[PDB]
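Consider the following assembly input.
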Amino acid sequence: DKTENDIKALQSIGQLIGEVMKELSEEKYIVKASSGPRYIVGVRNSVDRSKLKKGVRVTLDITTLTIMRILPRETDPLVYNMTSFEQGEITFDGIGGLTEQIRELREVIELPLKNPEKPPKGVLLYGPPGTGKTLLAKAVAATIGANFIFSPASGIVDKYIGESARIIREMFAYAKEHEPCIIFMDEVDAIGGRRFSEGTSADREIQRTLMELLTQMDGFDNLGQTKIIMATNRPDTLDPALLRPGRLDRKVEIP
Amino acid sequence: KRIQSVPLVIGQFLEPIDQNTGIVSSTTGMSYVVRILSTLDRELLKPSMSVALHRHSNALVDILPPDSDSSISVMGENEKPDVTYADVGGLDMQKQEIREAVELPLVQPPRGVLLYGPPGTGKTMLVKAVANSTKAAFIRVNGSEFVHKYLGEGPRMVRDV
Amino acid sequence: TLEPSTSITLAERQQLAYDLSISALLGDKIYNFGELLHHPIMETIVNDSNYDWLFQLLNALTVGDFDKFDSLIKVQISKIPILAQHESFLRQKICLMTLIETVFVKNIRMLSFEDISKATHLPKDNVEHLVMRAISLGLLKGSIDQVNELVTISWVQPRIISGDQITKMKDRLVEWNDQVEKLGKKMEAR
Amino acid sequence: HEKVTIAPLVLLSALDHYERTQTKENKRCVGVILGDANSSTIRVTNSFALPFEEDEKNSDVWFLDHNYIENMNEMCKKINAKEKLIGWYHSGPKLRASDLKINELFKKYTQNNPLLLIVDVKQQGVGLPTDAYVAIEEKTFLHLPCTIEAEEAEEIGVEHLLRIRLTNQLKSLKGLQSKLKDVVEYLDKVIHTILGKLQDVFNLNNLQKALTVKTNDELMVIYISNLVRSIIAFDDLIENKIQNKKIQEQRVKD
Amino acid sequence: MVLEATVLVIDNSEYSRNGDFPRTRFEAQIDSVEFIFQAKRNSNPENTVGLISGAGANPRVLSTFTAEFGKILAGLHDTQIEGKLHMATALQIAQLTLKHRQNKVQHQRIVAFVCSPISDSRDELIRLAKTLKKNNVAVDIINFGEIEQNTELLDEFIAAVNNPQEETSHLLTVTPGPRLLYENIASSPIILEEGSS
Amino acid sequence: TKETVYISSIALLKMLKHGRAGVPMEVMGLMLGEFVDDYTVNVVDVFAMPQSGTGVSVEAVDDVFQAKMMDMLKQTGRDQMVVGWYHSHPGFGCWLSSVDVNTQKSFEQLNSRAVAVVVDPIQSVKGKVVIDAFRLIDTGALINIQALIHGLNRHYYSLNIDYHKTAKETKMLMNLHYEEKEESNLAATKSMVKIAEQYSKRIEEEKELTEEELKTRVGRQDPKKHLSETADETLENNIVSVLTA
């Protein structure tokens, strides 16, 4: 019977996905295919023309091309493209001797959550990594309870001739939903920094990406319960505008 | 009349070739000579439009008044922004400047205005604060948003947005 | 509620219906006037004793002469003297209702005021109250022209009888009707 | 209150029932109606013949089985969940005290008070050949008005059928027809107080005031465009058509 | 044995309201029914019965045509206990009932409790009996009345229905005392013996 | 070859109304009718197979349900031949399924012949009806002939549709649109309330026109177009406003 189910389920066929861009009419919908462009579509059945709403992931049809189901939603490799590890492996103490930071960061990171009396914008490590340095993040991540979300850089725009905010906003939004979350962006000079001649190597990709954070930071997007740890081994390697408050309220030394 | 029908494909109208002939854009990237409503002509036909497209008859079913957020990647909207102005203190000249630049001419001339400097410094805050008071439909955009492989859509709502 | 069922006794029947007929008085009311008296509370109630009154009160519910009754009054009815007001309340309303129901037929309203209000044969300065009061009678609508001595009136007057406008009814209402068909000839047809 | 949608599918079928059942006026073909009844407008999705027996020789004698509805709804539910029992139909055209018995049987099976449905299997009189009653209770039952919906899929096949103002008047007689008669009916039927209740709103006519004449005031401007309505007609075509003719008639080169 | 449709006529009435032997008459009715109906469905499977209300102020079917437990199901719920004769009507219904009896070649049968004083007219009674015999119904009656209900319609009736016995009518008029209905009628050709015609 | 399919539009609309919700899946179930000599395919009725969560499938056909109904239908006096298959094929001019064929095919075994009735519940909505019936094989033909005896018959292969009802329902059906009197003149006497707007409407109709006319001096907002159109609508109500008096 188990195998039979598997046997049977081979009749059960795949059904396309998309978010509702909007509701044209009660049935009539503007939905960009999660695979591709927009389409005018109708409802189907077991469908709540009520519930059907902007940005709502829905199952879609291959031929009828309409809703095949209404859906929850989330995207991206949370543990891979996003990197999802909860808190950190060893606490701040095990790497102690950075204690200045240890305290100093905790108060400007962990606490502002638990004391409604700005929240902090951003915090940037620098100095040699992994000294406990990279570990700090985990040790940081450990202390708060938030989900530590690690960001390596270039994957956020490999090639992949695009994927910027969609990446980062999933990193934002998932965390924004999954908050408390720690956002830790590794050594961000490929997707961070002021670039070069500021010419186009695809640097225009970087600047965007460079700005996508800026947009989330100098933009109204806050760290609700999700916080962002910036990482660099050298600080001076970053966009001056990035260092700015409204983006970074802490420049974290590690002597 | 009855030949119209629903389960269509979205697109963007480009330009009429003649009356009852025009080129549109496909969300799929096609753009082609198609037929249209006998309904719209030149009047009710509109210069570019989000448009209802027959699939294999592949023709224009209708213009579309609505929507927004294909990719592109949407539009930044805080409708009624949360920022009062003068909340980065002393921007008066600049505050008046924007006001001079936009807030006033909104009533009564530039089509566009450049904010220059480090943003989010209060600089970006200028916008929302302004955008707050302005009581117009606000649209934030990120150049850092238009980065979708679908090089076919791209400007499409950038126009329509 | 008892109307369908529940066989009872007369000492149950009338005495209740008495107290009922009594509670008509200690009602009194939005009048009422006419009532369940139709229903077999009558003979049954009246008969006699205070039912005489209770019947004669139904008479006063029409006649509305004080001393056709303020004659009759013993303690129990004088026990609530406020009927002496209620009969004025009656007489007015009693006069009014038919004054209302008929006298104007011709799109009835005006009745305005005084002689018409003294036509209640309750006097003009009480008119300056009784007639003046309207839903301060609990009931009447309309208003007052003090100067011209005109009641403005509106409905809040129910009524009855038969035989009369019955024919009138269909006449006009078939009148346009028939005549309409002239116009009502081709229009959406053609 | 809950006044209802009407389903032509039902209506037709119910008549084919009537047809099929070979029902005569001696009988009324009866059956389930379907929909969902919660709203202040009930909808009738569907409806089903309840194989039945009716005898008015002895009124209360008649036969029906529920076990249909039993077996029915199961499939019906299995067919569609929205089918939930709203009530029931019959032929008619008119009521019989046998109804009330029949009525309350469904009350077992219905959410709210279930719904009667009169049909005119002869479709004779008017808008609707139909009434739908719901018991109230001194019993009450009542007809709330109802109508057809879309049901465009129906209307589409309906579109395959058929093929402004006046009618609006055309009922001018109907009630007024029976009405005074209806009086004279009851008048000389018994030869109730409700009728007198009907009475007072008669004066609600000869009412007309100068207030009336204010109509034309309104009607004045109402006519402003009457020129303009045709003024553009009064302008364009044959100008251009002549031009077009002058084009066309002068075209005529070789 | 039986291939025919039956009807169970229950008065829950001045008698059924009132225990004629445990636990009530109306209750004494009950398991006697299943007892009967068991033997009825043991007579043959597919043997069908109706169940109506001859009780109360409303005649009606309680259990419609079936063939198993769904009746025993249906009969499970009560009735108006003190109710009154619909019998004629109830029967006349039970007749029309059998006019719809399912997958005919099933002859018409009726089984009738008498829990009521039995008010009806002889001609009507016999018009029934006629109509039955016309319709060709098997009619057997359960009667324990005051006195009993007998020297009466019920006695004429079983006769009046009857040219052939069980193709038309047999009677038993239920006796008082430690008389268990199902035990009583075990005797009568209301059940067992010869069962149908 | 040229064959006559017939529907009581009841069964039609029944399908429709059932097919209208049918999406995604085809609505399935019996079809009730007969064959009168040849060519004659009538459908008096039809009905749903109860939904198959697995979707449309040859297994999903339950002959209990029919029996159930058909009994209750035979109880209704409702009785016919199962005349074939009917389904709702959204967006589908198409063809149904080799399965759907095999479905019918294994089924049409149960008959001399049957149908598989295509409905596009989507494109049926046009106000015309999209619909079809396959039964793919022939005797010879109207007698097509070769492909069976020469084997390998795979084609769309429609039958030829018709249907019939009556003037009876037709009248009642035209009765769609107490009633009108309550419903019309007099219910829409609601007219004078907005006269100020009815002015203002007309008053706004005004400005739109010189503007429009002005252009008279292609591409558009035509100088001549709305002008009439603009006002003209008002007229009827603008007209009838009088009538009730």
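Chains D and A do not touch (no CB pair under 8 Å). Ask yourself how this observation constrains the way the partners meet.
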